[PDB]
């Protein structure tokens, strides 16, 4: 009674579904064809706090399969820039998988499910405090999907990698790989 969800009336509803934190979608554009912008490519698109907002965003932005080469989407917890130099990423790393063929992959669905696992809090457990964001890279020869973590320490990290492997529907032979962002971090094989 007191609650009308979007499923009860999609025009006139009065409750919405919270996320466990605020999240920000970022977009990295290709270098400008005008020749005057190779160094200011990372754009903050929007910050959101609800499941409904996520879908209003997702339903009104280009899917991965429509992006130009050398574009990225980044979905990061509010306050974390999707750059290794952010204080919350500097000592961290990522689990990542490269899809060696851009055509044999429902990349839009895999990226969507990666974002849904992130915002739905099914990549890591409560108080693991590791997931900072997720990212998809569009490159000439490949797509890459990754989960950025706060540290490089450990069972918490390995389970995140296995959960990503599951979300991406990968068979056992296909390995998701962990790497530190910095050379020092990586200097100090972790695969699932």
């Amino acid at each position: 009674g007191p609650h009308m969800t979007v499923f009860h009336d999609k025009e006139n509803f009065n409750v919405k579904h919270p996320l466990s934190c605020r999240w920000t979608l970022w977009f990295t554009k290709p270098a400008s064809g005008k020749g005057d912008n190779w160094n200011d490519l990372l754009k903050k698109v929007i910050t959101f706090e609800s499941v409904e907002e996520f879908w209003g965003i997702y339903n009104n932005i280009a899917p991965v399969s429509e992006l130009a080469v050398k574009s990225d989407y980044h979905l990061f917890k509010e306050g974390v820039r999707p750059e290794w130099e952010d204080p919350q990423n500097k000592h961290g790393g990522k689990w990542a998988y490269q899809f060696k063929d851009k055509r044999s992959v429902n990349i839009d669905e895999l990226w969507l499910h990666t974002m849904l696992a992130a915002i739905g809090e099914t990549l890591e457990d409560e108080e693991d405090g590791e997931v900072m964001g997720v990212v998809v890279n569009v490159r000439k020869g490949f797509y890459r999907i990754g989960v950025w973590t706060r540290t490089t320490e450990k069972e918490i990290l390995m389970n995140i990698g296995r959960r990503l492997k599951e979300v991406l529907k990968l068979p056992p032979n296909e390995m998701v790989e962990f790497s530190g962002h910095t050379e020092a971090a990586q200097a100090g094989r972790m695969v699932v």
Binding site: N37, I46, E49, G56, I61
Partner: protein, 77 residues
């Protein structure tokens, strides 16, 4: 001018966490087993992907009235 759906979104109250008993026929709730183990049930909300996908064809309006033009100007050369 904001869509009716966006007006609703802006004025709606957050649910207090994961709720099981509020959905109409045919709509599944978030998996209660994922949330059984959560301690801070007022802060941490676990939603299975199947639950979240139910919204895909349901909330389709733009998150702001000028969103399309805003994104284009942000990204365009």
């Amino acid at each position: 001018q904001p869509s009716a759906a966006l007006q609703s979104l802006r004025s709606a109250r957050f649910l207090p966490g994961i709720v099981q008993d509020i959905y109409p026929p045919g709509i599944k709730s978030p998996n209660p087993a994922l949330n059984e183990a959560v301690q801070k049930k007022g802060r941490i909300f676990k939603y299975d992907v199947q639950f979240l996908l139910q919204f895909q064809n349901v909330f389709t309006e733009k998150p702001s009235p000028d969103f399309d033009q805003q994104v284009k100007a942000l990204i365009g050369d």
